[PDB]
Amino acid sequence: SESTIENFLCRSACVYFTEYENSGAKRYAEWVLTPRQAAQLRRKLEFFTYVRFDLELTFVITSTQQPSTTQNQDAQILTHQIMYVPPGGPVPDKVDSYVWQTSTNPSVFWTEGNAPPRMSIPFLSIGNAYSNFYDGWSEFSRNGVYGINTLNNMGTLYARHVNAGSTGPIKSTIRIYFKPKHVKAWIPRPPRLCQYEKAKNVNFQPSGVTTTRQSITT
Amino acid sequence: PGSCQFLTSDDFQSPSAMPQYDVTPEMRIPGEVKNLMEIAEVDSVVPVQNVGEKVNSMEAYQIPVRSNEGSGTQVFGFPLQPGYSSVFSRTLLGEILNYYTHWSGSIKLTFMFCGSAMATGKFLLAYSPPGAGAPTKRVDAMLGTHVVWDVGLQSSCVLCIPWISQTHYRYVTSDEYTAGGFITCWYQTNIVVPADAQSSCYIMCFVSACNDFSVRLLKDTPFIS
Amino acid sequence: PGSCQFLTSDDFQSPSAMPQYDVTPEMRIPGEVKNLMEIAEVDSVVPVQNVGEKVNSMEAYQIPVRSNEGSGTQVFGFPLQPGYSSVFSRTLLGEILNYYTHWSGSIKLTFMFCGSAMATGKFLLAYSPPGAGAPTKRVDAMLGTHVVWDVGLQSSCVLCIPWISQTHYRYVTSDEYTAGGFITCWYQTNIVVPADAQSSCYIMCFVSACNDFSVRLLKDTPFIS
Amino acid sequence: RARSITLGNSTITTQECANVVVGYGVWPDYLKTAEDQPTQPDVATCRFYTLDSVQWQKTSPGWWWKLPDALSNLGLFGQNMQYHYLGRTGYTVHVQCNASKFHQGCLLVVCVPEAEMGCATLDNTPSSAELLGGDSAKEFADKPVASGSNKLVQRVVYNAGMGVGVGNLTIFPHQWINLRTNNSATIVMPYTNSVPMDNMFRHNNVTLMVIPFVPLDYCPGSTTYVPITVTIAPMCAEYNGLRLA
Amino acid sequence: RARSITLGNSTITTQECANVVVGYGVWPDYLKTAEDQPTQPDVATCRFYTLDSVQWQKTSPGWWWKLPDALSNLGLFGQNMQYHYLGRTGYTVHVQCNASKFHQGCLLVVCVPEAEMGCATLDNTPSSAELLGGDSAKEFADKPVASGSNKLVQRVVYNAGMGVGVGNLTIFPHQWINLRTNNSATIVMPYTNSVPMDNMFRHNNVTLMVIPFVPLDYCPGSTTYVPITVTIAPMCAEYNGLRLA
């Protein structure tokens, strides 16, 4: 009963943690949607070849007062904007760009001190199932990289500070949770055995089959 | 109390970021997984000879059998705990069982003698009950739950061990488990081969599951570093 | 989680700023648009000759045909991707298709020979399958899916190309698309005119859509600066 | 007694009992968008394509043949792949192995879908030359491939080049070959892919792996190898229509 | 094809055709004096007791195992004989022998009742040590045992130690084993004795003799022995009631 894929692949897993400020060089966050960065969830997803699911994104945004020497401070409430760029959509080159205003990118404004913001993304493949494993080239020409189908593109995620609250410096961290929903899986395949190296490929270092013992009669 | 809080394990309805978008209909792709138990019911080769450099090669799986010096000597032996045990923790069964904290059921074991079509012998596969220790000699093994396996007639012998359950919490590695049984093989007779036929032959083992298997309290996998 | 947040793409009920105000009833105005697909089904003149200063004039649309030096020479040619292609990205069809990221369907092409009522010739309209490259000669074009168009009998020839789909994400500009077909015209016979009749004549093309056309994932238009 | 199975021009000999292994309980049937996406089926393509035999010796790790790539050069299948663009097909492997009663060994014949191989160097991906072998099988390796600045596919036999345990490859449609009981293996593979039709030159649908778990052993005087032989038949293959609606 | 016969915990492999030899046309059934002589049956005792294998070589006269004595030390049967006093039992010998097609020989498996052995010295009787061998078979001899002042049991193979012609032992329930046809022998022995119940430590009910009439022969290179294997199962055994009327 706990072994159904709905009960095996529907756990809120943290897949990204970063920090952006109201002043300074770092002013926004970005993260191409891809589920292969967290190994604990990648290893569970890699039990099947093709998986079709929906995503529930939960963001935990917390702001800390950066140490500074600016006198006479009195902060206001901070408002954040999380803009989710759908596949084939314009992406911001800077914080105060004109791409944050585009209407086809469903951004969500959230005011500090409430329930965490949350939005649900539907199946975004132009095909019939996401492919955990691909045995081909991205392009017909030699230029195409091996094992990278352009059909598992889930989009990108940009976050920023709508306004600078106080006159002092403030750093805000954003944690992203991944929760797959309505999961269907096809063609089960063996577990990893080896350790993971990169997020883009299945490259690995050859390892033993299992752990050793004193003797065969032990 | 209990509202305006974010709990990781909650099932609520979420506002769709992109509505008015027609998702592609589903198609018929072969081999749809419904439950993880079906995966745990496929026989998987068991590395019985995980001794030294044997693991970093292909000979870890094969079990060596020699006609000489085996009047009644033991061929092999291992405890009967799938998950948490060097011989079974890496199979399909063991890999599924290393996700749950509580599991009980029955295990199926299949041995396939891989030798010439002209070799004949006998073996004495014995099953020790949980509390009882592994047998010291061939007689002790016979006075129990044995199966005399003749490789001339049958080329494959199947077992169905019951009373298999979780023996420890978290993850432990230990030889000779107290609450688990032991499967041992003894040379009842030696390998009898004619002229111009190799007398050194190998065996292989396949571990599966059964209809009466339960798995509860899913946790993290300990093989991730 | 998911409450007390402003999401741009949400459908909720809003409190009316001005209630108790009777809006004017609707009237019957001709030509009510129900879907954008109907607009994409009106034939639009296609600028085939978008070569140099031809675009900044009216001769971009007209295709020049000369009887002399055309025993088997090619008259014109272009890939078959509506949106993202110089020849079709600015028509009605292309302008509707530059709003969606995923579109598949069939395209209708109409050619109208605009010359004297006394001119006769033949043309060889060929359709190259997606993977296959554009034909090198008139023979290669004939050994495929051609249509021999006689301008003495018929003054207009219509085609219905299928397998038309999105070839790239975002916006790309490229001649000779890999996953798209090519439409080319060859001079089977030369233009035969009597005395006191111009032998230089022009053609025109009209691109439309079909009932089997889909458009999904609406995005921003790239023609806005 | 034996049998004969005539598909088109080809004829092959098989045992009365063949114990066929249908892939996922599904027979490779046809496809069940009108004028927008016309499709045309090809029949003569179906027939028995016999690949070159491979000699199985005592020191032999294993082999691997990509099912679409292997026939990319033989008959109509090799031709159709060059002419038509999109195509969907199913297969029927017929791995047969002939050795006397005085030989001993064991082989695993497994059809793996989307067998994405690894690379010696973690930074880059394997070259298509070291990945695709046409008109010839590719062999595994006993020891690990030395890593460096190269695009050599990882080919260790135990990791299988996909970085898994070679004892768990049974999850996929498979069949064992004990030289003392079974002498052949038949596996019918349906069309497994996310899309109804795919380009056949840019994507391998299925991969055929034959790995000997138990080493071949024989007494001095017997033939020092065993000629494994593979026969592939494309089943229910259809391609895009090149006509004009 | 083979078969499996599960008696209690034990399981044994046998041919589809076993040609069982019921002893005297009688199956070893139960017993058909109220309170004066109460009797209690034991069931778990029934099971397959596999004795140690014996290597049959070219120079091998024969063997002999006393059916009550052989199991006097193994499991419940060994225990019950020590606890209860009077007991009646029936047997089911399963002499199996495995050798290749390149071996040749012939064996007689005979169950002899009241096999009273002779003694080298006519004046005295054989010692129980040279007569009873527990957990190990006793072997015959080629040449006569030298007579003297000793209690050595006469063990010449031709006289059989009972002083008869070894070609006439066929009168008793028996079975031949030709290494080119038969590979095993099954003999079901009923309870044969003057009394309904007898003391099991003071009287041997049946004796099992296995004598090779034709010597084992093989060419240099084959295994130089043949491991004969004996399995005994006590059948319908009952013992005296230790209760109080």
From Swiss-Prot, chain A:
In terms of superkingdom, the source organism counts as Viruses
> Where would you find this protein in the cell?
Virion; Host cytoplasm
Tell me, what does this protein do in biology?
Forms an icosahedral capsid of pseudo T=3 symmetry with capsid proteins VP2 and VP3. The capsid is 300 Angstroms in diameter, composed of 60 copies of each capsid protein and enclosing the viral positive strand RNA genome. Capsid protein VP1 mainly forms the vertices of the capsid. Capsid protein VP1 interacts with host CD55 and CXADR to provide virion attachment to target host cells. This attachment induces virion internalization. Tyrosine kinases are probably involved in the entry process. After binding to its receptor, the capsid undergoes conformational changes.
Subunit details for this protein?
Interacts with capsid protein VP0, and capsid protein VP3 to form heterotrimeric protomers. Five protomers subsequently associate to form pentamers which serve as building blocks for the capsid. Interacts with capsid protein VP2, capsid protein VP3 and capsid protein VP4 following cleavage of capsid protein VP0. Interacts with host CD55. Interacts with host CXADR.
- The identity of this protein, by name, is Capsid protein VP1
User: What portion of the full-length protein is represented by this chain?
Assistant: 630 to 847 of 2185
Swiss-Prot record, chains B, C:
Q: Where found in the cell?
A: Virion; Host cytoplasm
Q: List the disulfide bonds.
A: none
**Superkingdom of the organism of origin:** Viruses
Q: What does this protein do?
A: Forms an icosahedral capsid of pseudo T=3 symmetry with capsid proteins VP2 and VP3. The capsid is 300 Angstroms in diameter, composed of 60 copies of each capsid protein and enclosing the viral positive strand RNA genome.
Q: How does it assemble?
A: Interacts with capsid protein VP0 and capsid protein VP1 to form heterotrimeric protomers. Five protomers subsequently associate to form pentamers which serve as building blocks for the capsid. Interacts with capsid protein VP4 in the mature capsid. Interacts with protein 2C; this interaction may be important for virion morphogenesis.
Q: What is this protein called?
A: Capsid protein VP3
Where the shown chain sits in the full protein?
340 to 564 of 2185
Swiss-Prot record, chains D, E:
The upper taxonomy is: Viruses, Riboviria, Orthornavirae, Pisuviricota, Pisoniviricetes
Location comes to: Virion; Host cytoplasm
Task: Report the domain of life of the source organism.
Answer: Viruses
Q: What is the designated name of this protein?
A: Capsid protein VP2
Full-length numbering of the shown residues: 81 to 329 of 2185
Name the job this protein performs. Answer: Forms an icosahedral capsid of pseudo T=3 symmetry with capsid proteins VP2 and VP3. The capsid is 300 Angstroms in diameter, composed of 60 copies of each capsid protein and enclosing the viral positive strand RNA genome.
Q: How does it assemble?
A: Interacts with capsid protein VP1 and capsid protein VP3 in the mature capsid.
Its source organism is Coxsackievirus B3 (strain Nancy)
